[PDB]
């Protein structure tokens, strides 16, 4: 797109941020992320949106809090989180961003919805 760049991606480590490894965060990585990561429709969400490559120069004009499963995975692996709610919120940021940027019925929106369906099935069974 010519001098077009992507923002730097979200941090996946912060040494001055309080961290914990809860039973619920282990399940988020072990169940909820391994499940969605393997899914047939995961691929658009496994890394930050490459707006340069995909030729989407308004992406990061509309989406100011980007999130993707690549980011979430690295955060879960690097024990970035204090609790499972922080993580679940990143998942919801990723789905909402997609629904914001795109329009109902778009292939991408069907992919996100399939993944979100699956997300929620798995999160129902989050151990206390």
């Amino acid at each position: 797109a010519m001098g077009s760049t992507n923002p730097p991606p979200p941090e996946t480590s912060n040494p001055n941020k309080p961290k914990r490894q809860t039973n619920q965060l282990q399940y988020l990585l072990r169940v909820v992320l391994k499940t969605l990561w393997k899914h047939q429709f995961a691929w658009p969400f496994q890394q930050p949106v490459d707006a340069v490559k995909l030729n989407l120069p308004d992406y990061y004009k509309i989406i100011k809090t980007p999130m993707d499963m690549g980011t979430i995975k690295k955060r879960l692996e690097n024990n970035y989180y204090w609790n499972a709610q922080e993580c679940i919120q990143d998942f919801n940021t990723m789905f909402t961003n997609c629904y914001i940027y795109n329009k109902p019925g778009d292939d991408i929106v069907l992919m996100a919805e399939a993944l979100e369906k699956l997300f929620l099935q798995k999160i129902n069974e989050l151990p206390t």
């Binding site: 995909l54 989407l56 308004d58 940027y101 795109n102 778009d106 292939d107």
Partner: peptide, 4 residues
Amino acid sequence: GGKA
């Protein structure tokens, strides 16, 4: 097709 297209994402915009």
